[PDB]
Amino acid sequence: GFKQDIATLRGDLRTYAQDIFLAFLNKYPDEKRNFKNYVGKSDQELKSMAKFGDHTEKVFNLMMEVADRATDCVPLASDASTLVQMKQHSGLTTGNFEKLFVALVEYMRASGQSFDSQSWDRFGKNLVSALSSAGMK
Numbered sequence: 119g120f121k122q123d124i125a126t127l128r129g130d131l132r133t134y135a136q137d138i139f140l141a142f143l144n145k146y147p148d149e150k151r152n153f154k155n156y157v158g159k160s161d162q163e164l165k166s167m168a169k170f171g172d173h174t175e176k177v178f179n180l181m182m183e184v185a186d187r188a189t190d191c192v193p194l195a196s197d198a199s200t201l202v203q204m205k206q207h208s209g210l211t212t213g214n215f216e217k218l219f220v221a222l223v224e225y226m227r228a229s230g231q232s233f234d235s236q237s238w239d240r241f242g243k244n245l246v247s248a249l250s251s252a253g254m255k
């Protein structure tokens with residue numbers, strides 16, 4: 119289930135983080151409006167850009183902690199507030215997060231690994247609800 123999936127992802131976190139984020143960028147090319155430095159690069163080129171690997175891993179490091187601190191796939195309000203208030207998130211809306219989780223769930227369903235995709239769908243929806251509650255537009 120959800121808790122085991124956190125352990126699965128954490129066991130290969132940089133690889134999973136990059137592959138999920140790439141699936142997001144490739145499913146929603148317009149989302150590069152928020153990632154000007156990732157424009158004009160193939161997947162393999164992005165994986166050789168230092169900030170791409172380091173930032174994507176740090177994003178997923180924190181995402182797994184938020185997932186781990188959740189109860190029944192509902193995140194803590196403190197974690198939602200932190201995600202809304204981060205300076206690096208100033209330009210974001212909940213639709214950005216909704217699309218990330220759609221791509222993440224699609225990736226899990228297409229993988230050979232045995233993920234609880236429905237729980238990640240709920241987690242993404244509940245994170246969006248918590249972000250709106252904490253004041254993200």
Ligand code: HEM
Nearest residue numbers: 149152172173176177178180181184206207210214215218
């Ligand atoms: C649960 C989901 C997310 C978590 C836990 C998270 C966490 C983080 C963290 C830890 C950083 C700092 C990275 C670093 O400085 O190395 C960061 C930066 C950033 N995040 Fe988020 N993030 C999430 C979702 C998103 C989404 C959906 C978007 C946009 C579609 C986004 C856009 C950005 C941007 C633009 C930055 C700064 C520039 C960059 O690091 O490339 N984040 N995020």
Ligand SMILES: Oc1ccc(Br)cc1
Nearest residue numbers: 139169170173174177
């Ligand atoms: O550098 C970043 C990588 C992935 C996300 Br999601 C946000 C920022």
